[PDB]
């Protein structure tokens, strides 16, 4: 069946794993558990199309400066996640987008910008801010909460539809 190779990238601690686990297992993991490299495969029906989502959960930590290219090279779509309460993670977004363009030798690659942790009150990254950025990249912006599950499916299905239009 149709398969979609998705990759979730972004700074450590932003909630990459929590988003992915909400999707696949429907439940919030509120604990410290740094990722090295995790892979998830689930069968789903998106807009009537039966398909297999092959998801690669990456490590936010520096030291995996090498195995970064390898996964960015085979991935068809990327969820670039930052945390709305972490300015640094938001700024690092540019850096991840560039590595993806470099590795795939392409300016337009299926991508979605994801502002996670929208359930928190202490917001340091305004929404219009992220929206302008997304607008200049020519990509969609979606705020999520792996905590309450808001916008989680939205984020993933949208990425899929972007790959579909590519």
Ligand X SMILES: Nc1nc2c(ncn2[C@@H]2O[C@H](COP(=O)(O)OP(=O)(O)NP(=O)(O)O)[C@@H](O)[C@H]2O)c(=O)[nH]1
Residues near ligand X (CB under 6 A) = 12-18, 29-35, 59-61, 116-117, 119-120, 145-147
Residue 5: contacted member of ligand X, Mg ion, none (CB under 5 to 8 Å, by partner type): none
Beta-strand ranges (E) seen in 37-99 are 37-46, 49-58, 77-83
The annotation status of 30 as a binding-site residue, yes or no, is: yes
C-beta closer to Mg ion: residue 17 or 22: 17
Under DSSP, is residue 37 helix (H, G, I), strand (E, B) or coil? Answer: strand
Closest contact distance (angstroms) between CB of 151 and ligand X is 10
CA dist list (Å): 44 to 14, 52, 114: 25, 6, 21
The annotation status of 116 as a binding-site residue, yes or no, is: yes
Can residue 17 be called a binding residue for Mg ion (CB under 5 A)? yes
CA dist list (Å): 133 to 27, 71, 92: 30, 24, 12
**Nearest Cα to Cα of residue 155 among 49, 54, 52, 16:** 16
Can residue 117 be called a binding residue for Mg ion (CB under 5 A)? no
The annotation status of 33 as a binding-site residue, yes or no, is: yes
C-beta closer to ligand X: residue 16 or 97: 16
Q: List the Cα angle 16/163/159 in 5-degree steps.
A: 30
Which residue do the tokens 């429907």 mark? Answer: 26
C-beta closer to ligand X: residue 45 or 121: 121
Residue 70: contacted member of Mg ion, ligand X, none (CB under 5 to 8 Å, by partner type): none
Question: Which residues fall in the annotated binding site for GTP?
Answer: 13-18, 29-35, 59-60, 116-119, 145-147
Residues that bind Mg ion (CB under 5 A): 16-17, 35
């Amino acid at each position: 069946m149709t398969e979609y190779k998705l990759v979730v990238v972004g700074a450590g601690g932003v909630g990459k794993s929590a988003l992915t686990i909400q999707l696949i297992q429907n439940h919030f993991v509120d604990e410290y558990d740094p990722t090295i490299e995790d892979s998830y495969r689930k069968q789903v029906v998106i807009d009537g199309e039966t398909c297999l989502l092959d998801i690669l959960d990456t490590a936010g930590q520096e030291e995996y400066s090498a195995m970064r290219d390898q996964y960015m090279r085979t991935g068809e779509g990327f969820l670039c996640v930052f945390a709305i309460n972490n300015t640094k993670s938001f700024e690092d977004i540019h850096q991840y987008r560039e590595q993806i363009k470099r590795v795939k030798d392409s300016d337009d690659v299926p991508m979605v910008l994801v502002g996670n942790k929208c359930d928190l009150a202490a917001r340091t990254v305004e929404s219009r801010q992220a929206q302008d950025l997304a607008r200049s990249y020519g990509i969609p912006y979606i705020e999520t909460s792996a905590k309450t599950r808001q916008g989680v499916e939205d984020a993933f299905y949208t990425l899929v539809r972007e790959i579909r239009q590519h």
